[PDB]
Design a protein around this ligand. Sequence first.
Ligand SMILES: [Zn+2]
Length: 44
Amino acid sequence: GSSGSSGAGENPFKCSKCDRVFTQRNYLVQHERTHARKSGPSSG
Ligand SMILES: [Zn+2]
């Protein structure tokens, strides 16, 4: 007897930069273009 909530949904359209998801490719693109925080030699 363990039920209640299953958190947010899941979709194939996932963001590369962060861990975001969308119900379409368009909504994903507009979000991928907004990603302009990463600049210079800084990543892992
Ligand atoms: Zn993102």
